[PDB]
Design a binder for this molecule. Structure first.
Ligand SMILES: NC(=O)c1ncc(N[C@H]2CCCNC2)c2nc(-c3ccc(Cl)cc3)cn12
Length: 256
């Protein structure tokens, strides 16, 4: 066990330390407790205020204890059936929410840098919340953008420029990773280990061999969006404002 007025029940997961479920045995309030960038993660977390971003309640040192909004729905990762994905209507809804969360972060000059299904949680209402800001950083301050120069993230989810460029813009990288997540949601598999020239799967994609997995499992509509997101040249890659105007993005979907 317990921290101050909170008792720790179970180990909900773990980064990397351990994420525990805490209950204010008195007020019965339930929140997530993460046990331990760290300094920056807290600083960044303190700026976060959005319905699609895990809320930060506070921290305590004592090993720093981060108190976060509890998402009982777990990771989006576990809603993805291997080799199958999930119903398109569910995928679209999660993607809508992911975009809302990313737009917000980018609007406050914050880049997540580690968007993946393991870092996207769901509340009791199955609302998506962006989580795990341990790799996040500021890319815009005083209205002045700063290019990124460090390589952070998770290989299957990183944009190709991150592996080939000295410096790169932060936004297009987060957008790319969102497209990898969309791919996973609709195909139940990742398209490649990494977006490098030495990767057969990536080369096949650039060569537009969509008759191969996982592209063949994806409907033409969402697939056309993926064609705009997973663009090698970050300056040609689709932006969020344009994603929001995409045909599939705006397609009414019914399940079942
Ligand atoms: N803020 C939360 O709530 C929360 N934060 C982080 C979690 N795990 C990390 C682990 C490392 C990768 N990123 C996610 C996590 N797992 C659950 C959960 C909820 C319900 C079930 Cl059934 C299982 C896990 C809830 N959370």
């Amino acid at each position: 066990p317990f921290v101050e007025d909170w008792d720790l029940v179970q180990t909900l997961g773990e980064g990397a330390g351990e994420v525990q479920l805490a209950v204010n045995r008195v007020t019965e309030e339930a929140v997530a407790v993460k046990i331990v960038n760290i300094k920056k993660e807290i600083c960044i977390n303190k700026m976060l205020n959005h319905e699609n971003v895990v809320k930060f309640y506070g921290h305590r040192r004592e090993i720093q204890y981060l108190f976060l909004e509890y998402c009982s729905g777990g990771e989006l990762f576990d809603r993805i059936e291997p080799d199958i994905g999930m119903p398109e209507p569910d995928a679209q809804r999660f993607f809508h929410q992911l975009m809302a969360g990313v737009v917000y972060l980018h609007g406050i000059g914050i880049t997540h840098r580690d968007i993946k299904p393991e870092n996207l949680l769901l509340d009791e209402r199955d609302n998506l919340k962006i989580s795990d800001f341990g790799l996040a950083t500021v890319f815009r301050y005083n209205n002045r953008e700063r290019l990124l120069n460090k390589m952070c993230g998770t290989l299957p989810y990183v944009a190709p420029e991150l592996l080939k460029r000295r410096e790169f813009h932060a936004e297009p990288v987060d957008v790319w990773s969102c497209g990898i997540v969309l791919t996973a949601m609709l195909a139940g598999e990742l398209p490649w280990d990494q977006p490098s020239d030495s990767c057969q799967e990536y080369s096949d994609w650039k060569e537009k061999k969509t008759y191969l997995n996982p592209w063949k499992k994806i409907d033409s509509a969402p697939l056309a969006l993926l064609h705009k997101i997973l663009v090698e040249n970050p300056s040609a890659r689709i932006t969020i404002p344009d994603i929001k105007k995409d045909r599939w993005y705006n397609k009414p979907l019914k399940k079942g």
